[model samples]
Target: GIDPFTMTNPVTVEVTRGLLVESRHRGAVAVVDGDGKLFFSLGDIDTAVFPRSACKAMQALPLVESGAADAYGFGDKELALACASHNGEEEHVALAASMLSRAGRNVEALECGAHWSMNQKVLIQQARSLDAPTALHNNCSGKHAGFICACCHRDIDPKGYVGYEHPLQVEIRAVMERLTGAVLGAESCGTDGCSIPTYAMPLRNLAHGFARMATGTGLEPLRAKASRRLIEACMAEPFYVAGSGRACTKLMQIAPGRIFVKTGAEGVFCAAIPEKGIGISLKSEDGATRAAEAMVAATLARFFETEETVHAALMAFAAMPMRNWNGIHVGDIRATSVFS
Candidate 1:
């Protein structure tokens, strides 16, 4: 049995200023093949992690499989938004509102509380306009809207669908089990920040889940179809998956359909490379988002070094140049972990 509480040594990312280490971030990385076998690992791979918003695509499977997305005539953008942790920009909010309308639900039905946009420019504009945020502004509102739609298709009350005992959540749990191929009752569960159920499982299982999605392999016919749709929607409407300037959106734009990526709160990142049928997951021990991004980019660079364009794209994110308020480069945040 794996001990979840056991602490593992972390890979470091050092912030350097003229050769002096000014700061550091520590994290874990796991890479798995299509068969869910670990190809590489740093730190603890056996410990369970929440994976947070990184698993949105997996969480959205039941919605697509149950015919809710089709029954509502939702298209790629809507489908993409269903798996988004969006920036709450105008476009994101508009699409989220549209998703609720498609589900025959209203903004009031969104249980995710109000929050300002992650975009500083948008937030500044809102502040200047003296505009108050609403539930639709929540980053996870689109996800909640998707859940509401699932509830509608099941003829269950959309209200209080966040409850663990809700039929929608029960179906989600089953879908997750199928994707991860984890034995029933093996996952640890908890309430997500958005007031919906979240799961914690081994990193390899999470990677395998994404690998299956990437290749659309080893699934029931309906689920396989749904997985394909999910990937297509994400590739077609990458912007809807996350708003402007977000790493997930930028990575998809750079790699197009070649790589599928997502970021979760508290320094978690997950990705699947369709052509390679590989899945990668990473988490920062101190919950540093920069460390998570750097680790992912470094890891992907190591794997795809032979692919010119892909390697260059991955290298761009491998180390972020740190700048001061005046826009002068001061230091750099770079991965210290080496992958074979």
Candidate 2:
């Protein structure tokens, strides 16, 4: 026999209001308050998740903190651009192409495999043009380029920088482990889809890592300056963050440079609000990409109010109805979140 469960009232959730059609499954999420306090946690906050592209910001940090940002003269906005998983839109492609060329590397240097855009229209256009996707179109290419540059700054071989056991990777692992308060070893690693190593620390650790960037705490003065610079770079060059019409870019645009946002593969998402001294990490149980973005955006607005009113106001853009050519609504997506 099972005991009857009593429900609590006013749970204060931004998700699970029944507005979204996608089924929720299993995942972890966590939010940190302005002072770097834990505000809420759900499911396995401590379980490691393969953050995927969401790890770019940290990856680029070594560049800035190590004097690469200065040697390359990359600004905060440029660092932000480097940390992005940009969409394959024309401008996005152009920026990546330019960055690769500037680094004396070619598209061939990127190891992040090419893929068609998530937008069906763009994919169809590429197919119609008889064009195969290239490494330049890979969202993670910019990140790889940044890694290459970081290797250059350190006088390390750029070749195989993507290798799991490469020296560059070894240093990155040290930084990641330090940020998450986790020890180095086999416990933190999970292979990413693009053949790069990924970390699977708890969602709360994700928040904590971003909070470190957000609050600039415990970081050396120079490193803190670089961290803030990276945030500014991403905001100033928002297009490079995720390309035009992308949720990551759009959300950053809505925030007007105050909030930094990034998306990971498999519905992992995170944000940092430096001014507010907080960071948010979220994962969709069902891998619902749309819901993950919406939940984060709306939750941000709900928590900070005036600092981010556009979240709910922009819901229509975030969660639009999917329809057939005949205009019959077939399905839709929504975002949801909770502040503990």
Candidate 3:
């Protein structure tokens, strides 16, 4: 059984001081060094947690390592977007469509469940005259399509590819396990909102997995290259990474490829700055998206020296000059890290 006491105290770094923002427990974050080691942790770093969509890059590794990308002549941007938790914006859909065409596949081949993008406003606007939505709008569909392509490359059955013990899933699990330095068999599993199998592991392990992306070793270069390619693609086409006005896309744009950020459901954010040799993960205690973004910005500031510049570029977030309608300056959020 997992030991709950092994976890650390949950830390809430308030990003804004306002009428009602001062008294809430925001969340916890775990920051790791470049060597896939835990350099600092806050809150329940050791507690079991599911990374959800943050695992897409890791999941795309087997496909790249197995020569699927090369066989299909897929470029870095396509690979990156394939691993995306995209906003299902037109640009994202177009890229996914193009990638599928390159692999001689189509939208109909994806096995992952479909849904609208996370941006409710976009969904409402896009569906103004429509009565329903299609599977292509599903954020997880790109990921599922990538899995199908991998299976095609391996000459395996695409049906039930999302199954826990399926060959494709087995390979993804192996890749994740190897990256995280954690043994399988004992971890808990569930279905992600994207319809892919999700596993719950320690937050430290998740951060470690992102850090491993920086080392360029242990796993095959094909895998590392695939991960890097995804990062580059997201950087090159930031809008496709999420959508207009979305924090994930905006963060990628502001960092200009220096950092890779992916946000998951329930106020989760994970980022890796290979140039700085650091990987960071955060989870909001109350599942508030705004709090999650503010905490991430605060955490990045705490670890990296360029916090001011980064924060300046993301002024829309609460990390910088937070103020109420009356222009009253709010308190700043303080990010803290725990090191062993």
Candidate 4:
């Protein structure tokens, strides 16, 4: 049994007001180099934490490696969406629909249940129209579509594909184990928000997985090739990976080919700096989104403090400015992690 008390010593993101501690955000972070060596860690890196949506890029490996994507003529945008948890904007929904069609499946076949758009503007519009969201509106729709495509290539039944024992999901689990170097049997497993199986593993392993993804090393030839293609697709179509005003999209846009980021549910965030061959993973203990972003930004700042361009680019994220209803300046979110 996992000990809850083992998950402690979280990094703090404080909101201050003239020397007063207004609020505190606690989280944990892990940083790994290309060789899967731990460079830095805060909190209990040994505790299990679900990588959530951050695992999408890794999960999409099967789809790319199986030649399913190329068989369907998927381009950068489609491939990028396959690793997305998008905001369910028109473009995202359209792309998901097209992917389903290409896979010889319909949107109704998607097992990932429906939810309103993650985009505030789209949600308001949906409310105004009194229209209900479909599986296409679910953030995991792109990922589910990718799974269906993989199943199609394997000539397996795509129905009930989200089951843990399903062929596609079994393959995904194998890929996860390979990337993280952790046996699934040793970790706790549960269903994700998208109805797909999710695993909880040591934060160190999560960082190692992303590090390998960034460097494309220590993997089978086919997986290495697929990893490179995944990175290329993400670099080419950043917008499709997330959406406007989102951390993932903004971070990728600012750094271009140098950095890749993915945010998971419940305050989980991961990033990879390909050129630097570094990967970072963090999770806010109390599930604070602001704190997660601030922590990741802080980690990145420390990692690339000597790089002027990188430092300048990350300043905005590191010190997340807060505002009032009257547009007045309020306390900002700042990291308080002590690293030597």
- For model 3 the TM-score comes to 0.86
lDDT of 2: 0.69
Q: TM-score order of candidates, best first? A: 4, 1, 3, 2
TM-score for all models, in order of appearance: 0.93, 0.85, 0.86, 0.94
lDDT of each: 0.81, 0.69, 0.70, 0.84
Q: Write the per-residue lDDT of candidate 3 for residues 1-340, one digit (tens) a residue.
A: 2232445445564554654456454466778876755655666767667778876778878667778778887775667677677777676777777666766778877776667657878787658834655566788767776787787887887888878788987888788888887655535787888666888877777777787776564556666776676666667776655676688777777768687888877778888877877878878777777767776765665544556677566544544455677977776544433221
TM-score of 4: 0.94
The TM-score of candidate 2 is: 0.85
List residue ranges in candidate 2 displaced over 4 A. 1-22, 25-27, 34-36, 128-130, 307-311, 314-322, 329-332, 335-340
**How many pairs collide in each candidate, listed in order?**
0, 12, 2, 0
lDDT of 4 by residue, 1-340 (tens): 2222455765568887656879887777889987987777887778788889988999999889999999999989998999998988778989999998987888888999999977788788767764788898899989999999988877888999988888887888899999998768524888899988889988888988989988887987888789888987987898899987688888887767778888899889888888888888888888778888877877777766788887777867877777888988877888884632
Clashing residue pairs, backbone N/CA/C < 3 A, model 4: none
Model 3 Cα shift for residue 43 (angstroms): 0.7
Residue-level lDDT of model 2, residues 1-340, one tens digit each, is 1111212112222333235534443445677753456865555566566778886888787787777767776665457667988666666676667666666777877877898877666667667764688877777777777777777777877888878789888888888776666554666677776667887776777788888777777666765776677777887777788866687777777768787888888878888878778888877666767656765665566555553456455555445556668977766554333431
Candidate 1 has what TM-score? 0.93
Model 2, residue 67: distance off in Å is 2.3
Q: Root-mean-square deviation of each candidate, in angstroms? A: 2.6, 4.7, 3.9, 2.9
In candidate 1, where is summed lDDT lowest over 10 consecutive residues? Answer: 1-10
